[model samples]
Target: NVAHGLAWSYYIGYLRLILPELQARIRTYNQAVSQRLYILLPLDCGVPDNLSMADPNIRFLDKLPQQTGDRAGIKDRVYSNSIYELLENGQRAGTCVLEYATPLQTLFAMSQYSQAGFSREDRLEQAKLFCRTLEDILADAPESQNNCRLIAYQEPSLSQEVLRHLRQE
Candidate 1:
């Protein structure tokens, strides 16, 4: 079912390749439906169809900026699950989470706020550093065995941890 849904999304992607005029409308609809789980059967209470919240081996990351300026410093927050098996019989799928950051955002802030002391070149360097730091911090631990899935789940304790991590970061 997940594979089938992925195929449908790809079909839409293929449509975009051939149909430029319908791009706007098609994309709007696609965005609405993307990243959702199609339920063949109901799941347990408060459990998300798309992601596993009851995963046994969960981990998280929260890295904050080392410096403050118009030049955006590195900052990232991610939740990971090591044993994210999808169904009762399915092999462990992967970890998943929601991530928000943008190089363009860093560049824009740097360009707008001139008092940050960073020159244009310095801003560019800072942006690159921010991105690179993000790459490093978000990279999976070497001991982790499974691949990750960027999706969602619902669990109060896990949600609290995510919120707490973000607050500090």
Candidate 2:
């Protein structure tokens, strides 16, 4: 015979031991993670994890930038996972956009070039040159993840359309 006394409370007990501060910090982090999922927008986009990017409702913003190679194939399998959950019926107006953070632009230009079949070193150098030009053109901030808010369209109608579809609550 076996005896039991509160075996039903396994998870809550484990949570206390594993992530002790989870309850306290969750509310603060909850919104940001939701937003990151929105930017990631996994649905019907070929990524299995994206379909459940955050959750069925409530989106939040994340401070993390999308790392390279997340757009397809083997690379995606390696790094993608659900890091947060969206609250039900939670929604926001306007559109979500990703403007490359400084270092990211340099990294992306080079990576995109390399992916296009150019030799690695040659493509990297070329990307550096292109980045220098971008810096000259935009006079960017020197920070690691500088942000530039995007307007979402070339005209109001287009902007409205995007906001309607992508920003739908």
Candidate 3:
């Protein structure tokens, strides 16, 4: 036979551990991501753990401008996502006016060089260069693994008229 007894003086071991101070400290701080975008914090799964320890914290990967390539892939990914979300959210108004102008000048210049007989190779070279700078700029739409694991999905986030812009290299 077995017998058990409860001790009134050892009640602390029977109670749940509460970290009131830690809770207060956490609420006092801000998230690592931008405040402007919606944050999908997954407390129920491995996302939070992977985010904290898996994706290396972004810091000091660069000794100079050259190191941009080091973080450029992921950095471009997030920025492109943000801009697309921004535009998609603004489809009803005349918001399209603000975005279409940035690289138009480069585009005009490239065409001007082509027509001026600047040589097919030179024009194609600039075309390729322009294409690449924007190449890294636009891949966020197709990467599936990133969509499921990251904050949001793609495709429906764009307008049908937006097609002329996205399907390039």
lDDT of 1 by residue, 1-169 (tens): 1222322343233222322323233344344211211111111122232332433233322222122222134343221211121222232222223232223343445455768453554543443444444334324423212221112222234433333333332
Q: Per-residue lDDT tens digits of candidate 2, residues 1-169?
A: 0001111121223211322333223344444322321222111112222323323342324423322333235564322122332232344443233222223233334445745453434433443343344334323422212222122121112223334444443
User: How would you encode candidate 3's per-residue C-alpha lDDT over 24-113 as one tens digit per residue?
Assistant: 222333212111212221111112212213222211111111111123346622111111222234332111100121232333344457
lDDT of each: 0.29, 0.29, 0.23
The best candidate in terms of TM-score: 1
* Local distance difference test, candidate 3: 0.23
Candidate 1 Cα outliers beyond 4 Å, as residue runs: 1-100, 141-169
Instruction: Pull out the clashing pairs in model 3.
Output: none
**Model 2 segments beyond 4 Å from truth?**
1-97, 101-117, 140-169
Q: Lowest-lDDT window of 10 residues in candidate 3? A: 1-10
Clashes of 1: 2
User: Clash pairs of candidate 1?
Assistant: 95-149, 96-149
What's the true lDDT of residue 36 in model 2?
Answer: 20
